[PDB]
Every structure is written in structure tokens, then in C-alpha cells.
Amino acid sequence: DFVGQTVELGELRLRVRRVLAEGGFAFVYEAQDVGSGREYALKRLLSNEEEKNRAIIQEVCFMKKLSGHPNIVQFCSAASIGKEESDTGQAEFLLLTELCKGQLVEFLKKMESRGPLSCDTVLKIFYQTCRAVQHMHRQKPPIIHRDLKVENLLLSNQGTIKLCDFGSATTISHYPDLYSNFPIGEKQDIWALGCILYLLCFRQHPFEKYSIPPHDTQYTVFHSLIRAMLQVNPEERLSIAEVVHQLQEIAAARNVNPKSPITELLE
Amino acid sequence: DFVGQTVELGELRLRVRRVLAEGGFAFVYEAQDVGSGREYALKRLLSNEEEKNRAIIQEVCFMKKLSGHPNIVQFCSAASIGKEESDTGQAEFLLLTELCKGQLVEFLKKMESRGPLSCDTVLKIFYQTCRAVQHMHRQKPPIIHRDLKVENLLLSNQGTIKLCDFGSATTISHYPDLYSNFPIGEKQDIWALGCILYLLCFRQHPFEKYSIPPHDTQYTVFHSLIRAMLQVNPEERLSIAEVVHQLQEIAAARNVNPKSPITELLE
Ligand SMILES: O=C1NC(=O)c2c1c(-c1ccccc1)cc1[nH]c3ccc(O)cc3c21
Ligand SMILES: O=C1NC(=O)c2c1c(-c1ccccc1)cc1[nH]c3ccc(O)cc3c21
């Protein structure tokens, strides 16, 4: 019962059109700036606790830092209203970002009945997702996502993948700006990406030991990258640069621009 | 069975004299540089996991950032050795700091049999501890300790309080260097400090609702600060600047330099 309201956010005046997503912490809404007609995703996060406050501001900071990359949703603005000032009786945080076309799974559902995904489509989806995570892992210190899953991936208005969910992410604070090149979590993200790749090819989750279908002749080109990302030993497991590198070579060999629109999800 | 060993740490060569503290993650040792004869605390942290790696490096970063303050142990150096190179079969992190005289509780035990602590001694111990936490809360972003307890407090060679345990601490990463003055955890630290003050005066923990003794004529000057730090509502609860400010005025009124040595713990 928050839809219908027009909300002030800086110099913006936004009509809350409908509910895109919910869960525990928060809701996300489709919103439209009344005057300019531009559309946005608006996440509204309620807090009664300083621990919630900290998690919420950390998510905003991560979104701010990662913005600008073609495969991360664009951060537009953020703002709050004190609990004394809201009709929740709670602190409200407002986070305004790029409105996407929808969740990637919705589109995968619809493609699915028309049969397996083209190798090329799998390549584009996976590369674009790996580029977004590479962007996080390249930060100083690296930002570890920790909740990579296909359901959280979005498809942008241009048909490219957009990573949006930084509420589980973490890294080192007050990092000095002495020597250190230690893994601090990246490799759990890679495992997660391995599951996504498996899932895109074979349309099930590799766990709940895994198994690439023994006679698969369509996604064979991905098999060794899958196994490499699903090494149980994390030192053996690939880095994101090791995954991206291989994805670039696969792309160059198939004459595919892997950052291009995934127009087959848009038909 | 790590005591006896001489360990290399940069250009330092340190003899591991004995075990000061242990627990889960780690051990802390008394160590002596063979050549210069200077003494240190040496914490050795074992890791088989990237999550442990991250927690460990975060503790080191916090120690680095907070160093220089008279009431935080001084960070001297840090270093690692890969799991392939150690006789644990695990990554080892070495953290070298100021060797203190001992834990504050040891000294409190010994004072205790000689009767209540002077108001002045309570003032010095509490102020000095609050100055260390103020130093954390003043960082940008603020560093939240989250495990303030009297057992973790140390007494320095000069007779002043030294805070050392930053393994539970946290704050916001990739903080932008837009507006925000939200509590993110400070107030739970203040509650913890309130318990410490109560404990120093009345030699028991206020919980496991609390109760300042109804006829106390010795620590009356602290009573309203206690209640103020133990507000159940965290917006009502004082900030560290609000606590330190009052402690300065109490000190000025009793003609006490509250940062001076606590020479009565040293008799
Ligand atoms: O930024 C977003 N743009 C979006 O379109 C979007 C966003 C987010 C989102 C927004 C802020 C933080 C985390 C997720 C969640 C979202 N769940 C969604 C569910 C359906 C949908 O069409 C879009 C989103 C969505
Ligand atoms: O830095 C320290 N100097 C110390 O004297 C010290 C330190 C620490 C410590 C060191 C690194 C990280 C966290 C705690 C723990 C410690 N437990 C201790 C227990 C007894 C003691 O006499 C000293 C310490 C001690």
C-alpha cells in the first residue's frame, strides 16, 4: 500500500507505479519522475536498528562505487527520511537506480519452451555477468558479492545483463591507501558463477558432486570452464580474470561480440 | 609448542618467549627481538579459508588505522607465510604490536582485596578506555568495536589503558571520500561501556534491568552517566562524545588529569 504515492527525492518527484520485488529488508518499486517522465527502480528499505542502518548504507556505498560499468545497474540517487517523519514509524532509505526490462529468469522461462539456448546466447549472458563480477573483484580492496545466483541477474533495456543485488556483499574496510595478494572470498563467487554456467547450459543446478551430461555435443566448449570453476579446492579454482580470459577467446573463435545485446532473449 | 622458535619478520628476528593468550582463531605470544632486545606482543593467526583470511586482514587494517593513539596498542609490523611454507599446513599471519604489562583484570583482582577502587582510579580507567573508543568512532567511517569488555582491556608499561582486540570490529567499506549522519552501531559500544563503568564501581556486571546500589555514597558522581549509557533506547543513549565530555568535567572538578598513569594499579 505504498504504490500510488509521489515521493520527493532531491529535486525529483517520483510516482510509485508498482511493486517489482520484495522479501525481508525491503521492497523495490517501479517509479516515474512526474515532470520528466523518466523511469527508475526505487528501493525502499525500512530500519528500526543501527545494524540495519549500517547494512543499508553499505549497500548504497557499494552501488555508488560500482556504478558506471555496462553490466551493473546504474546508481542514480539515494536519500532517507527519519522515523519521526515517516508513516512507518521507522527510518526509510530510498535508493534510486536504472529500471531494467526484467529478471533474466523470466526471459529464460520463455526461451526454454523453444528449446536449448544457443551456445552464443549462453556465452553472452555468462560473459556479461562475469564482467560485472570482474569489476567488483578488481576494486581495491576487492568487493565480494557472496549471493551470485541467476534469479538476481537482470536484463537491461538494451538486452544486456545487469547485476544489482549488493546487499550480501563485503570486503575489507579502512584498507591502507606492507604487501598483500591473498584471496578473501573471490573464489566462493567463482563457484557460484560455475553453477550459473552449468544452469544456463543444462537448465538445472549442479547440486541438490555434480555431473556434466556425458554425451553433450552442444555445450562441450564450456565443459572445461565449468569444471575449472567448480574445483572443490579454492586455490585450484579459477580467478575471475582466468574465467573472463577464456570467455574472450571462446568469443573471438566464434566471431561473437560477447558484450553485444542478447537479442535472442528479446524476440 | 610454538614457544622457543625464533621467527623472521621483516628485518626483525624474534624469539617467541611464551603464550600470553589463546582461544579459537589464534595465539598471542611474548616475543623478543634477538639483536635489539626489544619486546613485543606477537599474534599468530592460522588460516585454511579465504573467509578467515579476510577477517584476519581486516583486523590488521583496523590495527594499522587506529595506531598512534595513546590508549590503543601500537601496531609495529605484520606479515604472512603461505601454507606450503609452514609446519601447520596453513597460511600464517603474524601481527606484531606493543607488549603491555598485562590484562587490566589481573590488576583489578589484586586491588580488589584491598577494597573499593578510588573514584579517581575508576575515572582514569574509564576515561582512557572511552578515549580509545572515541578514536574509533571518530574515524570516517566510524569503526565499531562490538566486543568491548573489561577482560580485553590492557594496562601499558606506563600504567595507562590500552585497547587491543579489533577482531570483532566492523564498519562501512568503500565509503565515498550526498549526505549521512546515521548511527551504525556506535550505540551498542556505548551500552558495553556502561557495563564496564558499572563493573568498575560495583565489582559486578549489571546484567545476568539493572540496579545501582540505592545508598552508594562513593560512586554517586558516576550514577547518571551509568544510566545514560544504559538507556534501552539507543537514540536516548549517549554518544561517545557525550560520555567523554562529562568525564572531562568530572576530571576538571576533582583536579585529576584523567589521562595520567593509573599509579594505584601499579603499587
Ligand atoms: O535496480 C533495479 N532495477 C530493477 O529493475 C530492479 C532493480 C532491483 C534492485 C534495485 C536496488 C537494489 C537491489 C535490487 C531489483 C529488482 N527486482 C526486480 C524485479 C523485476 C523487475 O522487472 C526488476 C527488478 C529490479
Ligand atoms: O597487543 C597486545 N599486547 C599485549 O600485551 C597483548 C596484546 C594482545 C593482542 C595483540 C594483537 C591483537 C589482539 C590482542 C593480546 C594480549 N593478551 C594478553 C594477555 C596477557 C598479557 O600480559 C598481554 C596480552 C596481550
Residue numbers in the entry:
A (entry chain A), B (entry chain A): 27 to 203, 234 to 264, 275 to 333
Which passages does the manuscript contain on this structure?
GAK (cyclin G-associated kinase) is a member of the NAK (numb-associated kinase) family, which in humans also includes STK16 (serine/threonine kinase 16)/MPSK1 (myristoylated and palmitoylated serine/threonine kinase 1), AAK1 (adaptor-associated kinase 1) and BIKE [BMP2 (bone morphogenetic protein 2)-inducible kinase]. It is required for the maintenance of proper centrosome maturation and progression through mitosis. Overall, GAK adopts the typical bi-lobal kinase architecture with most of the structural elements characteristic of kinases in both the N- and C-lobes highly maintained.
The dimeric assembly of GAK is a phenomenon not only observed in the apo form, but also in the crystals of the GAK–NbGAK_4 complex. The complex of GAK with NbGAK_4 traps the catalytic domain in an inactive conformation, in which the activation segment exerts a domain-swap conformation. The engaged and partly unfolded activation segment in GAK in combination with the disordered αG leave the front of the active site with a large void that precludes the formation of a binding groove for substrates. In order to provide insight into the binding modes of some of the identified inhibitors, several inhibitors were used in co-crystallization, but only two compounds, the Wee1/Chk1 kinase inhibitor and indirubin E804 which produced ~72% and ~90% GAK inhibition at 10 μM respectively, yielded crystals that enabled successful structure determination. The Wee1/Chk1 inhibitor binds with its phenyl ring located deep towards the back pocket. The planar carbazole core is placed along the kinase hinge where it forms hydrogen-bond networks between the pyrolidine-dione moiety to the Thr123 side chain, and the carbonyl and amine main chain atoms of Glu124 and Cys126 respectively. The hydroxy group at the other end of the carbazole core interacts with the Cys126 carbonyl atom via a water molecule.
